[PDB]
Amino acid sequence: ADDALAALGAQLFVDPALSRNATQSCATCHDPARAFTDPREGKAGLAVSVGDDGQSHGDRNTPTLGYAALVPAFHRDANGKYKGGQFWDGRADDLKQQAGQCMLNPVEMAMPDRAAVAARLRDDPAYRTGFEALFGKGVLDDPERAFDAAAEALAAYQATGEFSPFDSKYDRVMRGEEKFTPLEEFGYTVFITWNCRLCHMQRKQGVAERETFTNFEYHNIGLPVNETAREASGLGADHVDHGLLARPGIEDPAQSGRFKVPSLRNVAVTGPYMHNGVFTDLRTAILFYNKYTSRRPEAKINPETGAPWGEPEVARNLSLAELQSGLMLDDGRVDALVAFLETLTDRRYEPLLEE
Amino acid sequence: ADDALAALGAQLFVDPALSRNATQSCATCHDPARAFTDPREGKAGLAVSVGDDGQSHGDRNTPTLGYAALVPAFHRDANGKYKGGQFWDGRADDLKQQAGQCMLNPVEMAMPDRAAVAARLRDDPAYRTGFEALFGKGVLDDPERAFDAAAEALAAYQATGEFSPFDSKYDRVMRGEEKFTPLEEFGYTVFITWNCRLCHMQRKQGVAERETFTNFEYHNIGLPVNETAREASGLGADHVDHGLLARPGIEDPAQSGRFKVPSLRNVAVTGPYMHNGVFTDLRTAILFYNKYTSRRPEAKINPETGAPWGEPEVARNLSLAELQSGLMLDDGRVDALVAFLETLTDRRYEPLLE
Amino acid sequence: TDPRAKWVPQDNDIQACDYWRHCSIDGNICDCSGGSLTNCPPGTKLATASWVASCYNPTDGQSYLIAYRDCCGYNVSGRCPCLNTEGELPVYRPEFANDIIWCFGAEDDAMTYHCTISPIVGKAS
Amino acid sequence: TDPRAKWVPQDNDIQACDYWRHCSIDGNICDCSGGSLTNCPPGTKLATASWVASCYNPTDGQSYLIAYRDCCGYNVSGRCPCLNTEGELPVYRPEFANDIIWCFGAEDDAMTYHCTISPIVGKASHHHH
Amino acid sequence: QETQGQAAARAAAADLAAGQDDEPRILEAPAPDARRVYVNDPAHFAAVTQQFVIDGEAGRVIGMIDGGFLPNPVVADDGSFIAHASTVFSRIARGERTDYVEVFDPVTLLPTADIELPDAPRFLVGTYPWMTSLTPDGKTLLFYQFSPAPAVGVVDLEGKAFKRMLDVPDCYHIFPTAPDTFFMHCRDGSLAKVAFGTEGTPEITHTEVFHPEDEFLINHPAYSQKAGRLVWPTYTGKIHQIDLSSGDAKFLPAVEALTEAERADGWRPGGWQQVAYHRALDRIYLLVDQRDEWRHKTASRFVVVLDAKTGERLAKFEMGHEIDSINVSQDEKPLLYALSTGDKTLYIHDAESGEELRSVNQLGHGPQVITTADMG
Amino acid sequence: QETQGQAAARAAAADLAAGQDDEPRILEAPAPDARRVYVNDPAHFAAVTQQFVIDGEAGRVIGMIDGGFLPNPVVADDGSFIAHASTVFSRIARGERTDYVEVFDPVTLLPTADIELPDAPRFLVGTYPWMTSLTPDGKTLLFYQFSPAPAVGVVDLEGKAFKRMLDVPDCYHIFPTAPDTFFMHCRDGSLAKVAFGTEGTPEITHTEVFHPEDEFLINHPAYSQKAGRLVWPTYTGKIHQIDLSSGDAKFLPAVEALTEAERADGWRPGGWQQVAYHRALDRIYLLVDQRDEWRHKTASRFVVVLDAKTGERLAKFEMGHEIDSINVSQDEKPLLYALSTGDKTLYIHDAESGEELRSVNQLGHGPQVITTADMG
Ligand code: HEC
Ligand code: HEC
Ligand code: HEC
Numbered sequence A: 001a002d003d004a005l006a007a008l009g010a011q012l013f014v015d016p017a018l019s020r021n022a023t024q025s026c027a028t029c030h031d032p033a034r035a036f037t038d039p040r041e042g043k044a045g046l047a048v049s050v051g052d053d054g055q056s057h058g059d060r061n062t063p064t065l066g067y068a069a070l071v072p073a074f075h076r077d078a079n080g081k082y083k084g085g086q087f088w089d090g091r092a093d094d095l096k097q098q099a100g101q102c103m104l105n106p107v108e109m110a111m112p113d114r115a116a117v118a119a120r121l122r123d124d125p126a127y128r129t130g131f132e133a134l135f136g137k138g139v140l141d142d143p144e145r146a147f148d149a150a151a152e153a154l155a156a157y158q159a160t161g162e163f164s165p166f167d168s169k170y171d172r173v174m175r176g177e178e179k180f181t182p183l184e185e186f187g188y189t190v191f192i193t194w195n196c197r198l199c200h201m202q203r204k205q206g207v208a209e210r211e212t213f214t215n216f217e218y219h220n221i222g223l224p225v226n227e228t229a230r231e232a233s234g235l236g237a238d239h240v241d242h243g244l245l246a247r248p249g250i251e252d253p254a255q256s257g258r259f260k261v262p263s264l265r266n267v268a269v270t271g272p273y274m275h276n277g278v279f280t281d282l283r284t285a286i287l288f289y290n291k292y293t294s295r296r297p298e299a300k301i302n303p304e305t306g307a308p309w310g311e312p313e314v315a316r317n318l319s320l321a322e323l324q325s326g327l328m329l330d331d332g333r334v335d336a337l338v339a340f341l342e343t344l345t346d347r348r349y350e351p352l353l354e355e
Numbered sequence B: 001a002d003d004a005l006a007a008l009g010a011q012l013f014v015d016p017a018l019s020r021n022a023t024q025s026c027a028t029c030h031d032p033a034r035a036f037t038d039p040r041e042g043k044a045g046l047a048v049s050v051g052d053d054g055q056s057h058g059d060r061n062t063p064t065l066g067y068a069a070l071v072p073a074f075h076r077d078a079n080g081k082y083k084g085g086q087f088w089d090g091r092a093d094d095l096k097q098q099a100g101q102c103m104l105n106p107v108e109m110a111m112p113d114r115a116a117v118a119a120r121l122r123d124d125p126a127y128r129t130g131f132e133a134l135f136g137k138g139v140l141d142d143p144e145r146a147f148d149a150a151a152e153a154l155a156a157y158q159a160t161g162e163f164s165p166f167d168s169k170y171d172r173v174m175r176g177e178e179k180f181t182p183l184e185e186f187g188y189t190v191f192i193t194w195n196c197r198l199c200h201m202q203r204k205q206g207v208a209e210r211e212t213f214t215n216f217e218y219h220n221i222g223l224p225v226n227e228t229a230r231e232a233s234g235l236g237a238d239h240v241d242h243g244l245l246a247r248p249g250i251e252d253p254a255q256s257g258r259f260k261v262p263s264l265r266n267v268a269v270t271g272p273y274m275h276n277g278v279f280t281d282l283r284t285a286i287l288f289y290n291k292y293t294s295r296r297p298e299a300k301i302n303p304e305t306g307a308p309w310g311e312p313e314v315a316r317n318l319s320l321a322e323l324q325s326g327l328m329l330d331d332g333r334v335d336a337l338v339a340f341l342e343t344l345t346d347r348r349y350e351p352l353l354e
Numbered sequence C: 001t002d003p004r005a006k007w008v009p010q011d012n013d014i015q016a017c018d019y020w021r022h023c024s025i026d027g028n029i030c031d032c033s034g035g036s037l038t039n040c041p042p043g044t045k046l047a048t049a050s051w052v053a054s055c056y057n058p059t060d061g062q063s064y065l066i067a068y069r070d071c072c073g074y075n076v077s078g079r080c081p082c083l084n085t086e087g088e089l090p091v092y093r094p095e096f097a098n099d100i101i102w103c104f105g106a107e108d109d110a111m112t113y114h115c116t117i118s119p120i121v122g123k124a125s
Numbered sequence D: 001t002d003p004r005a006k007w008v009p010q011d012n013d014i015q016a017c018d019y020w021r022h023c024s025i026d027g028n029i030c031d032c033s034g035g036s037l038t039n040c041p042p043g044t045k046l047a048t049a050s051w052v053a054s055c056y057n058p059t060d061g062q063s064y065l066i067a068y069r070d071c072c073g074y075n076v077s078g079r080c081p082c083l084n085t086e087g088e089l090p091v092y093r094p095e096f097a098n099d100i101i102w103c104f105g106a107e108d109d110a111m112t113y114h115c116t117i118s119p120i121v122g123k124a125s126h127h128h129h
Numbered sequence E, F: 001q002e003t004q005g006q007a008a009a010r011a012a013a014a015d016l017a018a019g020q021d022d023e024p025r026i027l028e029a030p031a032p033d034a035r036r037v038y039v040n041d042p043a044h045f046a047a048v049t050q051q052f053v054i055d056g057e058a059g060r061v062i063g064m065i066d067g068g069f070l071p072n073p074v075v076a077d078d079g080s081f082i083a084h085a086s087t088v089f090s091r092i093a094r095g096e097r098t099d100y101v102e103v104f105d106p107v108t109l110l111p112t113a114d115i116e117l118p119d120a121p122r123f124l125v126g127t128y129p130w131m132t133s134l135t136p137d138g139k140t141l142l143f144y145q146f147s148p149a150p151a152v153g154v155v156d157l158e159g160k161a162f163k164r165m166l167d168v169p170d171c172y173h174i175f176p177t178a179p180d181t182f183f184m185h186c187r188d189g190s191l192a193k194v195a196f197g198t199e200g201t202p203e204i205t206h207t208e209v210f211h212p213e214d215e216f217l218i219n220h221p222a223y224s225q226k227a228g229r230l231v232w233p234t235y236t237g238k239i240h241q242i243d244l245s246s247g248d249a250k251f252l253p254a255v256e257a258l259t260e261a262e263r264a265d266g267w268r269p270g271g272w273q274q275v276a277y278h279r280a281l282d283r284i285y286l287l288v289d290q291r292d293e294w295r296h297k298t299a300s301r302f303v304v305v306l307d308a309k310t311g312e313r314l315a316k317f318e319m320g321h322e323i324d325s326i327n328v329s330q331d332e333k334p335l336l337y338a339l340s341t342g343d344k345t346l347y348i349h350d351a352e353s354g355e356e357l358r359s360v361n362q363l364g365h366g367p368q369v370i371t372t373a374d375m376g
């Protein structure tokens, strides 16, 4: 049943029949050749993805599905910090909820309702055999049961070893199979001693069994609007992406502007960066953190535009305690971090490092 | 010659013949019955003394001759502080210079010149015998030699054990002859540990052979003008007593308003107090030091007049480092200092303490 | 207590300078002044900066990266003083350097040194 | 060094707590931080206030009043620490009390305790001691 | 048996092995209880000093407090706050002086008040616990000023303000009895009752002279504010007890702590905080050894214990170290605390048997004052 | 033969016997000479610190200077003043930070300057002599900054004022060579030459990288400003010599301070100030002992002496105490100074023979830094 369920997820994953006009599958925006991200050029470059209708742009960068199965279900922990979930704003509890939401989102896959999904599943002979073996006869005639089963299969497929293979250079080095280059070694060391480790390690202390370089928390790091993506998404110039506060049932204004800390695995190959695809380069995303620590004028400047980073989209709730470390990354340590984070690339994506 | 010289000083000391109109001797203002001070009432009380002419008032309180012979000659020492001399302003180098000046001062003994003094000495048969034996024949015909010899005799007389007998209760206690009363003893302890000892002990440290409760220095403790004495002296309401700066040959303005630290010996019997007799009472004089230390409003008040002490006559060169000790004498300790200071009375003046 | 002999880790007393996690500690163990192995005492402020060392754990034969973080804004505790230097590098490699007061990032900009905690932040290599 | 045994004055080493003039010293001997038996070290401020004791001089069998004056405006020297209490009284007799920081009258209102000098200020004659 | 340091190691090893996460953070002190004890370290007059907060039951340091020059510690009886009056300078031990009062939270140890005392009014002395005192409610702290004259500073902890200086006569220490009243001890051998309405002179009434000029009352009497009991030893072991619970001074029968033959054989109190008093047991503890008459500030090796009502020696303890200051917790079956300035160590004993239970070393440079809360 | 405490009790009793008078007063320290030595007590990180000014010839403390939190001492070579960069807080160790420089008169020890450093810019590190440094003419003090980036602050001692921070590359320590120029050691193994005006991106030049990433250069090189000689040991006692006399870096031949057999038998440099250099004798002194490779901050019992031209060993002294720091007087017939942190004691040795001459004890809590003036 575990193999089988996952095998169904695989079929569903690449089936454009789960989109309204049958033009796109999960694999369209979550392309396996590119660490499950979108390689397609839209009105805003690679920043945001184009929907089933061929025009509608999202306001958020499409993230990797690699390692998403490692994220705990959404919850508030004993100290009042939200952890886990799926999407940049945590609006899905887990992989299963999230599958259903993506299928129904009108700016993306855009199925009208659970029943429309059910009809599409019902249309295909291999789905009848496949769903009924796992869920019981006539599952596909119950719009609720069918849809739910579909999401479950998609979820089970993203939990396969294939989405989280733990075969990066970093993984091999921790097994003792290879050594780091001195640059990479220095990079790793900088990463564990500087602020990065306060948000991009699973645990506060201890060793993680399956490290994915995120504590699964919610932070506002004070990013600007990505202007071309915001224009393209057509949400409007007055629109504010509130991050986690957008999740239904979150009312706390202290969450506004906060986004799920992304796993840094495969980061070297999944540009552009942040929740709005605002920076094209990995180096820029690192340099960004210098805005909070450095005294040099160059630190105010986005090296991509040659102009100030820009006002944060949300000016409150900034993670200042973490971000204002009092210590600036010189060019040396930036290069080092780049060498380290590159080591986090899955074996199968190492060829991609070159371009 | 030492006995003889002093014996001549003795006659001279009580001879009114050394005043212009033959009305007063040294003893007149320096009366042996009162620790060699002036007991006479003038226009300003006991504050200032009346001269030969019966009207002229000095601007300064006549001080005791008791223990004056212990004061070193006037000098600037290695650190720039003037020490020694005679008069409240140090204008006389020593006892000898001082005798001459008092004899010539027109608001006092008022002799016209050394020659007038010589004539008066020459007139008296006992002075011819007495001076010629000590200074040679015809000394009295040389106005200079005569005057200088008289001054010397006077000085030698004031160096006799009688002017400095060291027989106070304090002296007896230090020889182990008697004990202090617990009040007196508390007094002495307060005196040696509070600021008093920074100016009213001979030495900075160590033990004095013949302590006279003064370091012979010059300080401005910031006293006010004594209003009635200043009116009486006729120097004028604009006049400023500059203290040491008045001594000829002193040019340094830091000395302005500074006066010779007086010996405390016999202080209980030699009121009123300070260079201008401003305070009638020994307790007041002590309480005055509280103006620099105490935060209580009563400290700003002269218990004699019931009014603020008054602005200093000279507002510069105050001995603030010493006087602002940060510690206030309570009524207990003032009582104790009185008891102590009274033990500094010579044996022969103890009857006067009552 | 031959101070010059090779340092010998134990995993049995945290308040002793030979406790394994303290292999590059400089200063004082926080457990001795009201903190704990991995927390600051009351009133002090926890820095965000560290120096690391790889310290051998004699219990499991494994080596762990220890990020020493300072508790700041108080005068030095005076209790359980310790100084070890396994893998300690000169100041020009500040990552591994332990004469530096690592109080950066502490609340209220506290920068005075009180004591040092010894949390594990990774497995070494 | 039986700390409870009757104190035994010597007149041969001023840097030791059994030197005769230190019979009621509290704190540190100034001679150990660049002062001298009766002067303050450089940079410190000499107070005008004191506590006295009567200290027996084993050399001449005489008793002398010692006025302890503090040198202030510096942190405690840390060298030659001493505490003796010959005739030392409780605070309510501050003339004879030595827990008090006697820095009154020091230049610049210095009140911190560096060290104590031990000058003689008279020959004793006493009633409690 | 097993030191807190070994148990910690096991706690930590188990945490690692079982993979428990835990956020590094600022701890909070365990709630103040009867067996919490504070030790201050005057540091032989060093410019900066340390107070140590200790769990007396486990023998563990549970926090510390920093302080300036010769600070005055107070501990609120009910446990609700601690405080000190302290002194700093602009250039370590030199420059501009600021005297101030801090009020601290007793579990976070964060200051909740910083109250500047104008004109640097603090009495700078080897630490006497009762030269700065809390009043019954804890709404006022009062402190001693010596220069230019004995005086008492009124500080309002609740309104977080200094209020005024009170004129007093030649008197010493402060033992508050009421929100507006305290006794001090005067030169003339009396006690003064000082009662102040804010707005001008306080009512001053002296008691009767209760000791001769040549009987010497020590710098470190013990006082129980909840009991109104003052316990004042003399240099000889004699004990004046004054009961203040009525509002005015009633004098209890004086009582010898040392027998006639013990005194003759050179026994005397000696140390620093030489005396302790237990409220519920109405029982007195005193540091004693064989010493010369003018070694009254030196460590003692024995504690004696006696009934406050009668004077009957209940036990003699051999302490085993050079002890300078003692105090007791005010719970049932209390601890006897014995602090050695020389050892820098607080020794903790059973106040019944006097057997040493455990000890906390490394408490600064010259620790001298032990304070405890009286919480029931 | 006889102690200075005895010669004072001898002199004192003679004044008291002769009625020799003297005014109690504030001493002047003797004139600064070659044999004067300064010992700093970082105090193991205490919030306030001490410096001891010492006469090496007599082994007498002649004066003291109070410091804040890890102050950096300097001593002007010509003897005209000393100074420090220092740090204080408004509430002991908590509150607002003020960093400042003080200049002191070397005889009165009064401060003649007190220059604030804006934005509390000092590097707080265990004390390294060349983290704060005087230009040769004594007109500028340079201090190192680490947070947020390596930087070097410029302080005008003549006009008594903070000038500017310089941006430098990722480098460390300051060795001034001219009124307007100094060298640093960079992470990358080069030295950086920094030349600076009143404004301008300073001209920054790098030498050859002169050691690999795994040769380790100690926190305490010896630098002689008047010879232009920087003497730099590695963990193994290999020594780099750099000659900055010409104003550019020339490299001398590296010398081994320990033989290959001594290295095989476990000999390494170790301690704090491990190296000293005498200029007139052109001579190197290294603290060395048998020790594990990671015990390089522990004390050492041996000093080895070597000709700087050749590397030839001249002597191997056995110090007879645990030694953390060494230095030398710069006159003919120099003193080898040797500081025990453990003992809080300065041992004063003949540098030629190694014989211990005298010691100065009680130098604080954790003395570590010896400074001498080169007046020759
Ligand atoms: C919380 C205080 C963080 C700190 C400290 C660091 N990072 Fe981070 N990172 C954080 C968040 C919440 C996010 C998403 C922000 C958003 O709103 O989009 C990120 C993102 C990154 C990325 C790009 C990831 C991606 O798009 O896939 C990188 C490369 C990254 N962060 C690196 C990084 C480095 C190198 C840090 C130390 C200098 C660092 N982060 C600190 C949260 C936090
Ligand atoms: C009143 C008219 C006096 C006569 C007659 C004599 N003296 Fe006098 N004397 C008088 C005063 C007001 C003063 C102080 C004057 C001043 O300006 O300071 C003095 C002072 C002295 C002193 C100095 C004592 C000291 O300063 O401590 C001496 C030694 C002295 N007088 C002696 C002296 C002699 C020898 C006299 C007869 C020749 C004589 N006095 C007469 C007031 C009067
Ligand atoms: C120098 C700073 C002094 C200190 C400290 C004390 N005294 Fe003084 N005293 C001083 C001077 C210069 C004078 C005369 C000043 C003047 O202008 O006249 C005095 C005077 C007295 C007197 C009066 C004696 C007399 O008139 O014959 C008394 C009784 C006296 N001083 C007492 C005294 C006490 C008790 C002190 C400690 C509180 C004290 N003095 C301190 C100089 C200084």
Ligand code: HEC
Pocket: A013, A024, A025, A026, A027, A028, A029, A030, A049, A050, A051, A052, A058, A060, A061, A062, A063, A064, A065, A068, A085, A086, A087, A088, A089, A095, A098, A099, A102, A103, A107, A108, A109, A154, A155, A260
């Ligand atoms: C293009 C439009 C698509 C399509 C066809 C799919 N996704 Fe996927 N996805 C897309 C975007 C723009 C985002 C970010 C959305 C936001 O934050 O608002 C996502 C996100 C996910 C995630 C969450 C990953 C994370 O938060 O760390 C998952 C697990 C995911 N998407 C999976 C998924 C599945 C199962 C799909 C087919 C049903 C699918 N995506 C299609 C863009 C697009």
Ligand SMILES: [Ca+2]
Pocket: A037, A061, A062, A063, A270, A271, A272, A273, A274
């Ligand atoms: Ca991306």
Ligand SMILES: [Ca+2]
Pocket: B037, B061, B062, B063, B270, B271, B272, B273, B274
């Ligand atoms: Ca008079």
